[PDB]
Design a protein around this nucleic acid. Structure first.
Lengths: 177, 179
DNA sequence: TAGGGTTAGGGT
DNA sequence: TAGGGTTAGGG
């Protein structure tokens, strides 16, 4: 089976009273959990307002994310696919967006190439192939109706599209880069 | 005199018609410029929408920033203290915020200490000393929110600041998403 | 392989 | 030395 990283969900905005027990009972609705933790301050043991749960398979995570919104202990939480600790310190590592940067597609890639490839990850709202104000600059953007497709796509850094070793990144604004 | 970085302003949101002549003509109201450039696309020569002006002293930039807002060729621009090229790639390097992160102040630093130190950089809107909600002990860092972003930008040009007898570190305040 | 009327660098 | 009732990791 896939690594823990691909079976783990970051659950943000937990109620400070949420415990490993109550967090476990809820997400077990979609399968067996191999791990569950509420992150706390080491000194005071106070809840930090987030935690992690690990499902037994990717399919169990996809099922959980398909059943949003999630409410735990009377508070609406925001589950997200886990970003690896090694990405800490990089700009935009933990930003949640609906738009995807796609680079390395060169000049022979058009909107329909991206649509055929990415449509399987979720509902596509818009696709943009960047040009010069009219040559193609080699990269474009894909905007989904939800952030989870973007989060799932970026778990694989490189994606073969239209015969190119393409690179995917969560879309960042100018200020954030 | 200070180095160029401390005498240079990033001018964002320029009108695409603005040229180096009109940009100089505008900012020369506050002193002599040692450098001035409008950034352009090398291939198509189209304006990239920003440029840089470098004054002869830090008093001139401060005078220029004291006269905001700035409008050039019919467009309101956003001048900012220049962030060094070496900072590219760091989270929040180019973000514009009114709030300042202050670390290394330990448990013996209170609001008035931050107030006394930072009041000279600009008007302070709020000050927060972070504590543990359960233990109540101070966690060794706080935030200072100004009414403008420029005081923050000027402060962070000096990474280390002696506050209340501590080697304090200042950073532009970032949201959870940006970190 | 960082867009966009969204604003991070070229240099006698 | 990363908050905030604003959400990036312990075992």
């Amino acid at each position: 089976r896939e690594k823990e990283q691909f079976r783990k969900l970051f659950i943000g905005g937990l109620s400070f009273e949420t415990t490993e027990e109550s967090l476990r009972n809820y997400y077990e609705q979609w399968g067996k959990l191999t791990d569950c933790v509420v992150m706390r301050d080491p000194a005071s043991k106070r809840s930090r307002g987030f935690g992690f749960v690990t499902f037994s398979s990717m399919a169990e995570v996809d099922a959980a994310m398909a059943a949003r919104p999630h409410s735990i202990d009377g508070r609406v939480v925001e589950p997200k696919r886990a970003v690896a600790r090694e990405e800490s310190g990089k700009p935009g590592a933990h930003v949640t967006v609906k738009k995807l940067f796609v680079g390395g597609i060169k000049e022979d890639t058009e909107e329909h190439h991206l649509r055929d490839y990415f449509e399987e990850y979720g509902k596509i709202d818009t696709i943009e192939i960047i040009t010069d104000r009219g040559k193609k600059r080699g990269f474009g953007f894909v905007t989904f109706d939800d952030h989870d497709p973007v989060d799932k796509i970026v778990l694989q850094k490189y994606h073969t599209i239209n015969g190119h070793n393409a690179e995917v990144r969560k879309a960042l604004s100018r200020q954030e880069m």
